[PDB]
Scaffold this active site. Structure first.
Site: not given
Ligand SMILES: C[C@H](O)c1nccn1Cc1cc(C#Cc2ccc(OCC(N)(CO)CO)cc2)on1
Ligand SMILES: [Zn+2]
Length: 299
Positions: A78, A237, A241, A264
């Site tokens: 990002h 998004h 990426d 990726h």
């Molecule tokens: C980084 C890469 O370039 C990327 N970009 C877009 C997606 N990704 C992959 C990715 C997506 C996540 C996540 C996540 C995530 C987000 C919120 C979450 O919260 C869940 C909850 N516990 C709220 O705190 C229930 O609502 C849990 C996981 O980790 N890696």
């Molecule tokens: Zn991303």
């Protein structure tokens, strides 16, 4: 000539690693001509520096990770997307821990912090990688392609198989000659489907993940109370990426990227295949910015 660019001033930010859940202090610093983008772990003694280049990619699971021996800089995509969208050639990216902070999940806070510091043109020609031949990698139903193109454009098609897409593949094409990276791509956030949560759990990933840094999707809907920033934010998004991963080439691209359920892992295979096939690309400079197939904002 089109000149190399660095930062005019230092940028400081704090936030949390998406994957690590650690608090991280980020410093972006101006760098000399032909430095490229270099990440630095300043928590280690001695400091460990990893050039943001395809050869230093060690892991492509839910993020792009740079690796040098036992040392990692995770989730570079990002921030690198921001530095690609603003045409930054040279910068030191200092981190107090193993991961770039996630901020709001998008490139927005990075483009804002950088454009607040301002950019500085440098007395050296900006080097571009021009795509001369089509280069395609596939694996299963995923494909990623470079096509010759007198400009810079990214096309992406995802089929996430989820109610929120209403039985349609999500598709977008952006040409960055005619269309603003800042307005149309930079604000697109990270997303997390709750159906992936036992996977993330199993892998001890996304430890820093919340609605503050990601679009959270249950079996039916976006749970974020304020909804989406773009109608097609998921595929915008994916484009963000890909621009980040493509910047690991170490020079701005003159060409078109097409992704088909790419991520990726396959983005980094495309880069390796491009670099290896020297018949398919060349390095070019432009002595006259008025006749070049791309332009940049005032610094
Ligand atoms: C980084 C890469 O370039 C990327 N970009 C877009 C997606 N990704 C992959 C990715 C997506 C996540 C996540 C996540 C995530 C987000 C919120 C979450 O919260 C869940 C909850 N516990 C709220 O705190 C229930 O609502 C849990 C996981 O980790 N890696
Ligand atoms: Zn991303």
């Amino acid at each position: 000539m089109i000149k190399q660019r660095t930062l005019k001033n230092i940028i400081r930010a704090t936030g949390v690693g998406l994957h690590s859940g650690e608090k991280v202090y980020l410093t972006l610093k101006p760098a000399p001509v032909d430095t490229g983008i270099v990440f630095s772990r300043t928590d280690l003694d001695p400091v460990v520096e990893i050039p943001a280049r395809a050869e230093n990619v060690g892991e492509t699971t839910m993020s792009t990770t740079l690796v040098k021996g036992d040392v990692k800089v995770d989730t570079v995509e990002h921030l690198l997307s921001a530095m690609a969208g603003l045409g930054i050639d040279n910068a030191y990216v200092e981190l107090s821990a193993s991961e770039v902070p996630i901020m709001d999940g998008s490139a927005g806070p990075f483009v804002f912090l950088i454009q607040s510091a301002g950019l500085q043109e440098q007395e050296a020609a900006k080097k571009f990688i021009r795509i001369k031949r089509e280069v395609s990698v596939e694996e299963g139903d995923k494909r990623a392609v470079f096509v010759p193109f007198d400009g810079f454009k990214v096309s992406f098609e995802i089929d996430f198989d989820h109610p929120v897409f209403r039985g349609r593949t999500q598709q977008a094409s952006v040409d960055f000659s005619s269309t603003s990276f800042v307005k149309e791509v930079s604000r697109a956030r990270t997303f997390g489907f709750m159906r992936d949560i036992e996977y993330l759990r199993s892998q001890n990933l996304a430890l820093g993940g919340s609605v503050e840094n990601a679009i959270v999707v249950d079996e039916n809907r976006v749970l974020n109370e304020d909804g989406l920033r773009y109608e097609d934010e998921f595929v915008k998004h994916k484009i963000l990426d890909a621009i980040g991963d493509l910047y690991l080439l170490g020079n701005s691209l003159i060409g078109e990227f097409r992704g088909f359920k790419s991520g990726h892992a396959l983005n980094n295979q495309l880069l390796r295949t491009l670099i290896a096939d020297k018949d398919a690309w060349e390095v070019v400079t432009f002595e006259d910015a008025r006749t070049a197939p791309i332009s940049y904002m005032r610094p």
